[PDB]
Design a protein around this ligand. Structure first.
Ligand SMILES: *C(=O)CCCCCCCCCCCCC
Ligand SMILES: *C(=O)CCCCCCCCCCCCC
Lengths: 41, 604, 604, 604, 121, 41
């Protein structure tokens, strides 16, 4: 967790972070991208 | 527009022939229609996300803009000169072949790169369930971190780049809200790159989950149109192909199946014994057809399959009648002159072929398992073929014993090894079997309530019955799945049936005192268990004597209901019992909050 | 915008009621939003492709431009006057109803046309696997052609139009690269109309196949939200409906199931015999309840099903005790006064109803199979109904024998035909059964590690256990499928569990010398086999005494991990073992190149 | 573009750093790309539809325009400053976080609202199958209505708002055509809001159903790429993970399985008996290894599983040899010095551990079922672990009896309880087993035609064979499903094989008189049953001695054919037997028209 | 079920209960199917207007208000058990109530000396 | 009690709130609204 500083806009051990799940926003990237023949073109 | 772009090779005037795919040193420019940019953008978007980890580890090469693989050509874009003429596009955005190659191998190369890191980020992320589905629940960050500082095994990648993975993470888990730099406090809202998608997956308390209930429907709709559940009780010849019978090899236990319970298996019900002989491999053996009726697999009405009669664990009393020992058990065909069930004595049996004997007598195949010597699991096995039995009116497959010397001891034995678990496997799907005949088409409606209790369980692997069972079974999972045929909600399924019972019980009341006005509260409830009994055991609808379900209306009715029922579910079908379902989710988040509370204390 | 187009109707300013669906002689113009043109273009595009075969065979009628079915009207387009008012579209592209009819029946008529040819092109194309997945591999064209000139059966359509099918083909198989006219050489690149799609399906060596790995994920995501794998170990009442129990009729072998191993089956454990009588069809028979305990299906705790006790292949010793022969085997209910397991003698048994006898005594149902006469496969069968047993505190279903005259011979026999394979089929899904009681809701978490080894395999078709098993089974295939719980990759699944073991083993260490600092290398590995043992045999998580898996945390934990795990797979999840997977694909292309080499020699 | 919108925080000059997610009091504006508006519009469109029911019941709040949740900001929109710099969008349409919240909870709240009504509308709609699939068929409206006025149970919502539900309905069922106000007659055409979608689902008589045939293909394509059917007979090491083995616990019946038919099970084939002793729980018992060979589960070659040997319904002759009674049946390991199958007498058996005994002797576990006392269904069960047997060259699991006192009576008994149904469940997927060894990778091609008839059915739960069977089984359902391997259509599957047989039979003819020019009509037909026999029983392709199917070419061939075959089906694949399929649909509509005719009379 | 689940009503002098505890307490008791757990300060804002017990902390001085301003400002003021005389809302009704009867049944004329239809009773 | 922010002018877990009954203001909404025939009109 050693301080970095600019590489990325947020420090991990940074001031006032906060792990806190909300039933409201179910974390998700993009897995189901459609590529099948008919659907991709 | 769509397809490759074309341009007037003959210049100026572009007719349906003065065109030509504008190919060149880069390959052929294919048009990138609006939606197809959504994909390549959605793919690149998911890679750019990992920007902070690409720089950290000096891989990558800057953010991948989809505008680096395309171009701004203009011409007519279609699939063929003729139709491309009706799509004059100006300064459209096309991607040349050689480019369609990089945007491909780039998204592929980068995809590996991230696929790896993305795996480390995960073993650490999910390693503290950042996802609840009812209300909230925090877990003081210090602890959390100081905790994973432990658990995470020394070869992750979340220990070598904490806030190089954290920055990637913040965009995938709206659970981790980074503390704002100029107020040094969270944000209430969480802004992960998947802003919308993640909003529309949360288990919304009004109705289960839109992403769920939506698919469970489109999924069922697929099947309904696919297999051909529609037309499930159609009354007219249908090619077996229409039933896509696959992976279908059912096994039995004959020498038990009554002849009338399944046409493909006749029996030698004759007074005395019918000892015959046959020179097999020099040695002369005697097929017995002993004391009892000895049910044998008939050959006609037997779709050229792969019969594999297994004889194992089954008793082998060579201990008593010594006559039994010494005889090599073997599946043998038996061509009889007079039709079986009319074949009295030996002179009646034309010939007997040992289609597959077992090397080594009955005293090496044995194995003592507490007195009663059993059969060492072995599989005898013919490969019956429709035409190898051409002309031959009577012929039967019999997995008997082939005694090397009949005696008084084997006078009440009857060596039929058919008590074993035989497994026929139709090796030629195109041809089915029904009521004892081989056909190429079924008549669905005919097979409904036409089999008996066991004229079903005794069906022959890939025969109408087994096909008109594999079919109902799909339709049975579409209702079971999508429709709510398992609650007091008088659903679309049990509703289609109720309307039949009414229209039915209503005309049966027409003519005569009509002393009984139709019920309805009783009809709704009777049809509810009818539709329910179906989802339950799809098969039943084939057995003669099943209430409601077996009248010609139903099924033909049911399906076409369930049909339109799926094509309207809405999206919030999940509203069903979305109350207890919700209350159960809060139940979990309360217990998971309890977990975070320890992570929060133990590792302060 | 979307929906039908509306336009101001009657006197007044445009308003929410001024509007009216602009219908007319053509039907109603429905708007053709951007994406919906992608489909009809993608559909027509796939037809135009077959242009060279339409002219050759004088069918068709020119290329189908989607711009022939639409129009350029303008107005407000919504689903209802109210909301259509907020979508003023000018010169949008709408398709009138009567047109939405042709673009339909045209794409349908043409679709048949091509579907046919397209089938001939194929039996010839795939008839030489034009698809490899690692590196390249040619096959000198002359040979290839001169070869198919043979194989192809005389009724194809690729022999009547070679380079009329070839031109269609070149656009579907980037394997066949036509030789350019003005340099008479190939092109390196292959330009098939499916330029992009075909590029994005190639098994990219970096990560298996984007089209694969992508779907295997969205597929799992569907289930995860659908069935309701989430909430899998929720601790609170849940309607059976929430478990979509369908096609669920399990079969057993009672008269073996211990009474304590499954509440729905009590036994008459009494000293002597309990010969009772009953006039059935005139004739008076004696139910036995012989020497042993005679386990009988209890009626209460028996969800109104369709009990069908099959009695076949099972021994029938009418040979010894002649008493047994002559008695028609039959499933019979038995109402007892004092509760069973307290019912001593005949005067205790209130009444006995033959709910289903077998016509013809025990000497026609037999069939000699080597001394030991078996039972000709037959199915006795009641249709128990919750309320037909109202009030009646004690009543049991028993598939006994009904001896026409008890004797000394049958003094150690005990005619329970329950040794047969009974098959109960819940005929009314809404109601489940648990621990002996009938309910309408389960409490998942309760059924975990609460059954014993066999208090599971002895479950009653559609009872909590069988439901809390059908559920885990789905969640078991989502992990088994999507997540890599079968390699040393400490995946998201086995990771969610590890965090529980830590937090758990960590507080159990709190208070007292804490001489053991948590392990982790040992915890990771212990939780790996825990998550693995689950995917393996989903059931286990119900049996008392299973390491890790049965602690309240896990599962509730696992799923919610596996959950978020699927919602992030990326696309290149296939990077897992994409090395040996790749090396195996090159292995195949090397062997397939070997094939083309013979096609290349034999047919020079 | 896509992602959140950014703007030059440093003003004017927008570089790859002078940007910053434009967040604020509303959250972060995320861009709403063209297609993502299709969804939220398609979702809201399906809600607006229910407008007439929202006013009627004073809920709702006016029509939901998607233009109420968005905005018209402008800036650069990407996933990260770097890539967002290449998407300058002006006056794009973004939805702020707090808005992405309402459009969410609104569509959710409204979704409940309608989900409910929408359910009542249905129990009434489908309650008269408004969907036929061939030709038309009316049902005079008066009757219809006056009829449902009955059936519909008093708690619907279609009785409280008839033409408040009717107006919602008219837009979902193009069956109900409302009578036009100013000509008081129908309309011929039906204009339901789902105008297009409903047009493209009708079972078009040319080809089954586009919505069906389309999916049944994309569905198969998913699998083909997913599981990894491609590479199905790859000849090279493949991680077991590549086979996603899940929910895989197979059960047997040893003490029957020949030792050579399955390496994981050796037998003590020794002359006399081998009575050994062992102090178990104080009391001294004698393991027997009786008269017969007593096949025992070998421990090496036994993937640390969960062996659970069930002993029930199986005979228990404590009646004759009294020696048997009193002995607690129990699964026991047996470490022998000299390798088994070479272990002659007691002094040879190193030690014997009772890994799991059954409390209570053999006279409480019994239960008389007609003379022959059986075993009360009980499950003994070890938890074998790879390394608990480290070093130990010879050790075997044996479910024997443990007699408390061997006698002359048990001199021909042999107490192996292995005749029971043992169920091994691999508890650690990563490791597989092949030919007796434990591995981490299979070599597919090796397992083809390498097992014997029963060297397959005797496979050990999660061993190469069982894995190279679970795999073919998927590929078997892709062909069975998508491809027409069940009609005389010489499909792409049976076609890929035919080309192999030719190339094969053609070179075997090279060199020597070549008196036989290849056949082809006979080859097509031989390969048709080969591809067919595969779809039928996928397994066979593992057994030595199966025509065609087991030559190295096929399969590796088949799949790669079936592969490209699915990636071209077109859409109208349903044209296959779309004639009888059509004729069957007309058959149903003729019978359903018959129904409407009664609804039309009974309730005039 | 959440409000009265902590008697927000006393009738003599005052009496507080440090808010943190109070909340962290009801966070427990309240059964998982209420609606005060799904919207805390969406119910709280409704509540503040019905219970002059809950005084919200002012945003720009981060302290209570002494006075409590619930929408029922007057009504709630005139129901407090005023120490001078029991409760105006009570004593007022117990009177109008009695007045009703007195005129109603016909208690007046209770010992009237002259024929009266039984109906009059 | 998770922070909201604007939906309503007060946070529940907000700064310096205060449960504190006063015998003076007996909490009460509007239940006894008169609607009887003669009295409503
Ligand atoms: C410094 O690296 C100390 C360890 C703290 C973080 C290491 C990784 C564990 C936390 C992950 C944060 C990013 C997403 C999980
Ligand atoms: C977050 O919601 C934590 C729980 C704190 C308040 C929940 C409801 C209990 C307090 C009620 C406040 C509004 C009026 C009672």
């Amino acid at each position: 967790g050693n301080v970095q500083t600019s590489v990325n806009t947020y420090n991990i051990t940074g001031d006032g972070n906060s792990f806190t799940p909300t039933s409201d926003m179910t974390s998700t990237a993009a897995p189901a991208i459609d590529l099948k023949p008919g659907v991709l073109n | 527009p769509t397809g490759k772009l074309w341009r007037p090779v003959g210049t100026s005037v572009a007719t349906i022939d003065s065109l030509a795919i504008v190919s060149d040193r880069f390959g052929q420019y294919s048009f990138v229609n609006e939606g197809m940019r959504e994909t390549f953008s959605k793919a690149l978007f998911d890679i750019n996300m990992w920007q902070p980890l690409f720089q950290a580890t000096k891989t990558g090469c800057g953010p991948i803009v989809l505008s680096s693989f395309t171009t701004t050509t203009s011409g007519y874009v279609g699939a063929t000169a003729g139709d491309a003429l009706d799509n004059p596009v100006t300064n459209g955005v096309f991607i040349s072949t050689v480019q369609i190659m990089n945007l491909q191998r780039t998204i592929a190369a980068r995809m590996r790169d991230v696929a790896l890191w993305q795996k480390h980020l995960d073993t650490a992320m999910t390693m503290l369930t950042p996802d609840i589905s009812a209300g909230s629940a925090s877990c003081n960050w210090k602890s959390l971190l100081a905790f994973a500082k432990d658990i995470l095994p020394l070869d992750n990648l979340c220990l070598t780049y904490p806030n190089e993975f954290y920055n990637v993470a913040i965009h995938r888990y709206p659970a981790l809200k980074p503390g704002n730099p100029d107020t040094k406090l969270p944000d209430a809202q969480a802004h992960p790159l998947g802003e919308v998608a993640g909003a529309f997956n949360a288990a919304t308390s009004e109705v289960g989950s839109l992403v769920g209930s939506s698919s469970t429907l489109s999924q069922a709709i697929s099947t309904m149109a696919g297999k051909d559940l529609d037309l499930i009780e159609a009354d007219t010849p249908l090619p077996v192909s229409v039933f896509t019978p696959s992976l279908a090899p059912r096994s039995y236990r004959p020498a038990f199946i009554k002849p009338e319970d399944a046409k493909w298996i006749a029996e030698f019900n004759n007074s005395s014994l019918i000892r015959k002989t046959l020179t097999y491999s020099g040695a002369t053996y005697t097929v017995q057809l002993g004391p009892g009726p000895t049910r044998v697999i008939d050959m006609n009405a037997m779709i050229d399959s792969v019969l594999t009669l297994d004889v194992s664990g089954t008793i082998l009393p060579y201990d008593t009648n010594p006559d039994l020992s010494t005889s090599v058990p073997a599946f043998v065909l038996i061509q009889t002159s007079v039709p079986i069930q009319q074949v009295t004595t030996a002179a009646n049996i034309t010939a007997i072929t040992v289609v597959s004997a077992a090397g080594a007598s009955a005293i090496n195949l044995a194995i003592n398992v507490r007195g009663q010597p059993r059969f060492n699991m072995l599989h005898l096995q013919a490969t019956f073929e429709r035409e190898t039995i051409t002309g031959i009116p009577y012929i039967y497959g019999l997995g008997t014993f082939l005694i090397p010397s009949p005696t008084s001891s084997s006078n009440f034995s009857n060596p039929t090894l058919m008590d074993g678990l035989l497994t026929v496997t139709p090796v030629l799907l195109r041809e089915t079997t029904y009521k004892g005949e081989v056909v190429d088409a079924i008549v669905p409606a005919t097979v409904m309530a036409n089999q008996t209790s066991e004229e079903v369980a005794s069906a022959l692997a890939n025969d109408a019955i087994v096909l008109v069972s594999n079919h109902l079974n799909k339709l049975a999972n579409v209702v079971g799945d999508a429709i709510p045929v398992a609650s007091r909600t008088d659903d679309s399924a049990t509703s289609a049936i109720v309307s039949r019972l009414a229209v039915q019980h209503k005309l049966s009341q027409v003519g005569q005192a009509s002393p009984t006005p139709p019920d309805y509260p009783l009809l709704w409830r009777r049809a509810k268990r009818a539709a329910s009994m179906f989802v339950s055991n799809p098969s039943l609808a084939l057995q003669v004597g099943i209430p409601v379900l077996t009248q010609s209306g139903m099924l033909s009715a049911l399906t076409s209901g369930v049909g339109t029922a799926l094509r309207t579910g809405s999206l919030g079908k999940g509203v069903t019992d979305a109350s207890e379902k919700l209350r159960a989710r809060q139940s979990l988040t309360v217990a998971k909050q309890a977990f975070f509370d320890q992570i929060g204390s133990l590792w302060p």
